[PDB]
């Protein structure tokens, strides 16, 4: 559809817009380059592992690898919908979001190549619950925005992408990674990438909060919609978490070798903690 004007010809940018401030922060804090990470020690660590120690780590790399690729493809509709609404600053920020997710896909792929599991097909570690989030509810809530950019539709998209997938599952997976391999001294390069990802993630979640909150503020009925959609997806969050935990408990050889006290009951409380505190970053008024 035609352009009926431009905002930097009639006016300029709203330099005070929060998303323009988040865009500035993204440029300042987002220079990291996955190609600069040294994985030579990760290749050694992975080689050194038993075959059952090798398996131990893969499920979590599987969920992250697919999940990074999901959001890289699935954030595009949000940028379309905000663009077409004239939210120039949001769009400017989303170009950093999309580039972040591209580096995230690059990072996990370079690790896989480095430790020798590139060809390996990690799809096996996506159970039914994971697919229901990432293969289904995520792409549907985002793609919807190409035809339906109502406040409800925008809230549901930010809830699934930013509050659940990033704000709940990715946050908990970063924690999990540290709680396990930071303790073992394993996979230094991967953990360097995880810290980089975690930092980017903070801005991803902050776009979600601002997007959800700016719609709640127009009509508090949408607060209810937000809590509802969060609760709708919790079964699949926790059923993927339960499944990964069951995998962890029958794969105990890396825990023993490295004297890791893998407290799965605690990881599970972190997930529950993340989910509830995302709810609490949305105010009903």
CA distances from 35 to 46, 164, 178 (A): 19, 29, 22
3-state secondary structure 104-147: HHHHHHHHHHHHCCCCCCHHHHCCHHHHHHHHHHHHHHHHHHHC
Minimum gap (Å) between residue 96 Cβ and Mn ion: 12
Minimum gap (Å) between residue 204 Cβ and Fe ion: 4
111 vs 177 by CB, closer to a copy of itself: 111
Q: Does 149 bind ligand PLM (CB under 6 A)?
A: no
Residue 68 marked ligand-binding = yes
7 vs 150 by CB, closer to a copy of itself: 7
Candidate ranges 85-93, 126-134, 161-169, 271-279; the one touching Fe ion (CB under 5 A): 161-169
Q: Which two tokens stand for residue 203?
A: 């801005």
190 vs 271 by CB, closer to ligand PLM: 271
How far apart are the C-alpha atoms of 66 and 71, rounded to whole Å?
Answer: 9
Contact (CB, 8 A) for 278 and 230: yes
> Of residues 42, 74, 149, 166, which one binds ligand PLM by CB under 6 A?
166
Residues making up the chain, counted from first to last: 285
How far apart are the C-alpha atoms of 142 and 7, rounded to whole Å?
Answer: 26
Q: Does 248 bind ligand PLM (CB under 6 A)?
A: yes
Total residues at interface with a copy of itself (CB under 8 A): 62
Contact (CB, 8 A) for 191 and 112: no
Classify residue 21 as left (phi > 0), alpha (psi -120 to 50) or beta: alpha
Interaction pattern, residues 175-214, with Fe ion; x per rule: CB under 5 A: -----------------------------x----------
Which of 42, 34, 170, 171 has its CA nearest to residue 115?
42
Q: Does 176 bind ligand PLM (CB under 6 A)?
A: yes
Place of tokens 């549901």: 156
> Of residues 50, 116, 118, 249, which one binds a copy of itself by CB under 8 A?
118
Question: Which of the residues 57 through 86 are near ligand PLM (CB under 6 A)?
Answer: 60, 63-64, 67-68, 71
CA distances from 141 to 78, 133, 160, 229 (A): 10, 10, 7, 11
Which of 93, 64, 95 has its CA nearest to residue 171?
64
Q: Which residues are annotated as a binding site?
A: 68, 101, 104, 128-129, 161, 166, 201, 204
Q: Which residue ranges make up the site for a copy of itself (CB under 8 A)?
A: 1-13, 15, 23-24, 27-28, 31, 33, 35, 62, 65-66, 68-70, 72-73, 76-77, 79-80, 83, 88, 91-92, 95-96, 98-99, 101-103, 105-106, 108-109, 112-113, 118-119, 121-123, 134-136, 139-140, 143, 146
Q: Which residue ranges make up the site for ligand PLM (CB under 6 A)?
A: 60, 63-64, 67-68, 71, 101, 104, 165-166, 169-170, 172-173, 176, 204, 241, 244-245, 248, 267, 271
């Amino acid at each position: 559809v035609h352009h009926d004007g431009f905002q930097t010809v009639k006016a300029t940018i709203d330099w005070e817009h929060p998303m323009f401030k988040l865009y500035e922060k993204a440029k300042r804090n987002g220079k990291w380059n996955p190609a600069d990470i040294d994985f030579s020690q990760d290749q050694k660590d992975f080689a050194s592992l038993t075959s059952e120690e090798k398996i131990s780590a893969l499920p979590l790399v599987a969920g992250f690898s697919a999940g990074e690729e999901a959001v890289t493809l699935d954030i595009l509709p949000m940028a379309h919908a905000l663009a077409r609404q004239g939210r120039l600053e949001d769009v400017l920020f989303l170009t950093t979001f999309m580039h972040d997710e591209a580096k995230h896909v690059e990072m996990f792929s370079r690790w896989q190549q480095a430790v020798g599991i590139g060809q390996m097909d990690l799809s096996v570690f996506h159970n039914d619950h994971y697919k229901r989030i990432f293969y289904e509810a995520l792409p549907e809530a985002m793609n919807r925005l190409y035809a339906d950019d109502s406040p409800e539709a925008v809230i549901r998209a930010a809830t699934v992408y930013n509050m659940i997938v990033e704000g709940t599952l990715a946050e908990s997976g970063y924690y999990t990674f540290r709680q396990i391999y930071k303790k073992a001294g394993l996979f230094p390069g991967l953990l360097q990438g995880i810290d980089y990802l975690n930092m980017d993630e903070g801005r991803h979640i902050q776009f979600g909060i601002y997007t959800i909150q700016r719609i709640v503020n127009e009509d508090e009925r949408y607060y209810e919609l937000f809590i509802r959609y969060m609760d709708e997806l919790w079964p699949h969050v926790i059923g993927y978490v339960d499944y990964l935990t069951e995998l962890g408990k029958r794969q105990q050889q890396l825990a023993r070798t490295y004297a890791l006290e893998i407290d799965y009951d605690l990881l599970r409380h972190y997930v529950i903690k993340q989910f509830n505190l995302r709810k609490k970053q949305i105010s009903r008024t």
